[PDB]
């Protein structure tokens, strides 16, 4: 119903456009003003897409179709050191961001090495809390092959590495190894696009799975209702105060202090505790909301 896109335009007369979006029933998921241009991730009903395109072309704006602007991705790097973090890992994260997703760098405590690499249970659960996980591996076939125990999560997976083709029982994208320069060559860009296509395919499949038994309320409108009701969400200092997942939300407020308030939020005629699973998150003691399906 609500297809999510990105509007890129100027700040002049942007308030009138926001008023129009409110009038037609859309939601402004994201807003950022750089100097004189504003980027807005907006979720509006499908029957108003052409109307919004006409409105955007009136303000000399630009509509960018974001195929991943409803999910949060766990980019898993073996460590946050100079080998992986300041290059490749950021390129993967920023390319994911370029298509609307909300990434989270996951630097494993013991992810480096060949036979000394291990993944903890807490890291496993933290990765599982996301929608899809992207692994940024090295550039040796033997090292990657002797490292399959790292990619043991019941989440859609895309593994990236140096060698062009791997023989692991997962999706693999080659020519994205451990590097030290910014990814700007044509081959590297093509490999990034291939990784984007793989994650897009997995996300669309999962979207069909969810569409078989739709949730009682969409995550985006649930986030809007929480923002309207809860008055502490504008005091959050995190990058994304409320993250829109595929079938839920992540509220970046303390669980011990605000879970009772979150649960006792009335949407429609239901109480939130009766339609969603509110639980504490392994992510800095935040609140994780998982929506129930109409079957229950």
């Amino acid at each position: 119903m609500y297809q999510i896109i990105r509007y890129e335009g100027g700040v002049y007369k942007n308030n009138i456009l926001k008023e129009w979006i409110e009038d037609v029933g859309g939601f402004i998921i994201q807003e950022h003003v750089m100097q004189l241009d504003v980027y807005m991730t907006i979720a509006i009903p499908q029957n108003e897409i052409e109307n919004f395109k006409e409105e955007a072309k009136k303000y000399k704006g630009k509509i960018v179709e974001t195929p991943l602007a409803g999910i949060e991705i766990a980019i898993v790097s073996p460590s946050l050191s100079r080998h992986h973090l300041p290059h490749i890992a950021c390129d993967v994260s920023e390319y994911v961001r370029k298509f609307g997703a909300k990434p989270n760098m996951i630097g494993l405590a013991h992810g480096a090495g060949k036979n000394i690499s291990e993944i903890r249970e807490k890291e496993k659960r933290l990765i599982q809390e996301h929608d899809i996980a992207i692994y940024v591996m090295g550039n040796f076939e033997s090292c990657i092959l002797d490292k399959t125990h790292l990619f043991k999560v019941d989440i859609p997976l895309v593994v990236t590495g140096g060698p062009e083709t791997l023989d692991i029982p997962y999706t693999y994208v080659g020519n994205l190894g451990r590097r030290a320069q910014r990814l700007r060559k044509g081959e590297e860009i093509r490999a990034l696009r291939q990784m984007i296509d793989e994650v897009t395919k997995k996300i669309n499949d999962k979207r069909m799975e969810l569409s078989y038994d739709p949730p009682i309320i969409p995550p985006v409108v649930l986030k809007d209702e929480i923002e309207k009701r809860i008055d502490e969400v504008r005091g959050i200092l995190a990058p994304m105060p409320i993250v829109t997942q595929l079938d839920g939300l992540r509220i970046k407020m303390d669980y011990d202090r605000n879970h009772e308030e979150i649960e006792n939020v009335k949407i429609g005629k239901y109480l939130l505790k009766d339609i969603a699973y509110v639980t504490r998150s392994e992510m800095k003691n935040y609140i994780l909301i998982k929506l129930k399906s109409t079957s229950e």
């Binding site: 308030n15 409110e22 037609v24 029982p169 309207k228």
Partner: protein, 499 residues
């Protein structure tokens, strides 16, 4: 011949005959619905089933080549039995699959729909419904076709004796409503054609916003200034402030007034069920006859407001008496008691307050105390609009001007520092200003927006003490005078537009 009209059928061939009884303000739009198309289209990215053990839902995800097989060979897979349920998961069939069988084998996933050919012979291709995560086990180019999620228990419980019999897809059906818009009367009706003429509006909200909506719909017609796929809006009063919040769901046929922003005062009617908004004050609902709102894209729509607007300010005292007694409201007089006395103020002035309190205090004025003015709307559009907004003539028939400062010949009125924004110099004097001229100082001077009038004439200063370049003439006092000289500071005088 025999056509169905509203709820009581008519027979008249021309539109005039059938809409004669239906009350309708001329000039409004007329909506005609022909019928329903009910187109049935199925693409079935997700496929259903009718097994002996139940019904699951499959869904094709990976294109490859086996989905092209499935597209029409699933009906060839109809009425096929389970072949095996061994460690190679549950497979059905078995029917011919001519897709080239490659010894190269690709990894599959838990509960994934697969069309693998078990035995590398085209004729024995199995509908292998994978249950467990299978690594390299099978053949074929890429047997991956879809994913089983819905009805997983059905596929798990499925035994060798059980068959899939009929392969359902989803049976997805769409609906199209035929519609045409018109405003002709002399046309021929064929048969069983449905006509809608007006809509009924039920008002229940905060008093000021509801009064704003009633003022919009005082004439029974709602202009369609903006149209989208979700609402139609009216822009007659787009610069009038309201401070009321009624943030509940903007359901189908909900009437809201925007209370903040560039479009404060616009009246919306929603054709789609949307979420609540803090910037929209719901003033009521449209009960029946929604289709005229649903199908109209421009023009006028005849609207009936169930609570009549009980604001009698341009009327005489006897009219207010009879109208309020016909509504069963206790009444009392404050000012002039004469039956022909013009009402000037009523307490409470809002229809909702009157209905909830069941009493009105009506104040009349002396015939000679009412100031008669004429407003130059064509000469100074922006200034006349500002004057109407500040004096209240946009909503009622009698406006109030408050004396702000006074000296001899000059009487200056109060300003509204909310409507005096675009006060560009509009109608500036060219010769000496004559007596009894109403003027507003434009943005040039420091005291922008102050209205004033003087009872004499001078060739240098306008009615507000500013030079001619800083005053724009908006109107003049036409009939009643010699009351501006006997009104103290702070007292309100009442005006009536005579055009």
């Amino acid at each position: 011949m025999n056509v169905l009209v509203n709820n009581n059928p008519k027979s008249g061939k021309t539109l005039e005959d059938v809409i004669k009884d239906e009350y309708y303000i001329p000039g409004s739009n007329i909506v005609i619905i022909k019928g329903t198309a009910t187109v049935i289209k199925e693409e079935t990215k997700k496929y259903l089933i009718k097994t002996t053990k139940g019904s699951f839902v499959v869904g094709i995800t990976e294109e490859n080549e086996t989905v092209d097989f499935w597209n029409k060979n699933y009906k060839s897979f109809e009425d096929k039995s389970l072949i095996w349920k061994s460690i190679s998961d549950v497979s059905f069939g078995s029917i011919e699959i001519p897709l080239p069988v490659s010894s190269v084998k690709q990894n599959f996933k838990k509960w994934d729909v697969v069309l693998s050919v078990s035995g590398l012979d085209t004729s024995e291709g199995n509908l292998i419904f994978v249950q467990r995560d299978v690594l390299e086990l099978y053949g074929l180019e890429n047997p991956k076709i879809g994913i089983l999620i819905g009805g997983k228990r059905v596929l798990k419980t499925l035994t060798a004796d059980d068959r899939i019999i009929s392969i359902e897809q989803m049976r997805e059906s769409k609906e199209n409503i035929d519609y045409e818009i018109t405003t002709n009367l002399n046309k021929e009706i064929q048969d069983t054609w449905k006509i809608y003429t007006y809509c009924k509006a039920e008002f229940d909200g905060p008093p000021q916003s509801t009064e704003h909506a009633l003022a919009i719909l005082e004439n029974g017609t709602l202009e369609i200034s903006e149209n989208t796929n979700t609402y139609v809006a009216d822009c007659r009063l787009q610069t009038l402030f309201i401070d009321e919040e009624n943030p509940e769901d903007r359901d189908r046929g909900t009437i809201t007034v925007r209370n903040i922003g560039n479009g404060v005062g616009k009246v919306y009617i929603y054709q789609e069920s949307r979420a609540s908004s803090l910037s929209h004050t719901v003033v009521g609902k449209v009960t029946d006859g929604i289709e005229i709102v649903d199908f109209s894209n421009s023009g006028h729509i005849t609207v009936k407001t169930n609570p009549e607007r009980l604001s009698v300010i341009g009327k005489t005292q006897k009219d207010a008496k009879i109208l309020f007694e016909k509504h069963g409201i206790t009444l009392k007089m404050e000012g002039n008691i004469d039956e022909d006395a013009i009402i000037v103020e009523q307490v409470p002035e809002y229809t909702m307050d009157i209905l909830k309190s069941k009493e009105v205090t009506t104040k009349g004025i002396e015939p000679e105390k009412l100031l008669y003015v004429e407003i130059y709307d064509k000469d100074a559009p922006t200034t006349s609009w500002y004057f109407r907004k500040v004096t209240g003539l946009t909503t009622k028939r009698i406006g109030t001007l408050k004396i702000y400062f006074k000296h001899d010949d000059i009487s200056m009125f109060e300003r509204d520092w909310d409507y005096s924004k675009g006060l560009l110099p509009e109608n500036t004097p060219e010769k000496s200003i004559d007596s009894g001229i109403i003027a507003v100082t434009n943005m040039v001077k420091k005291y922008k927006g102050y209205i004033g009038v003087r009872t004499s004439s001078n060739d240098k200063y306008g009615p507000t003490g500013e030079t001619f370049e800083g005053t724009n003439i908006v109107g003049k006092v036409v009939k009643n005078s010699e009351i501006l000289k006997s009104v103290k500071q702070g007292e309100n005088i009442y005006i009536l537009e005579v055009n």
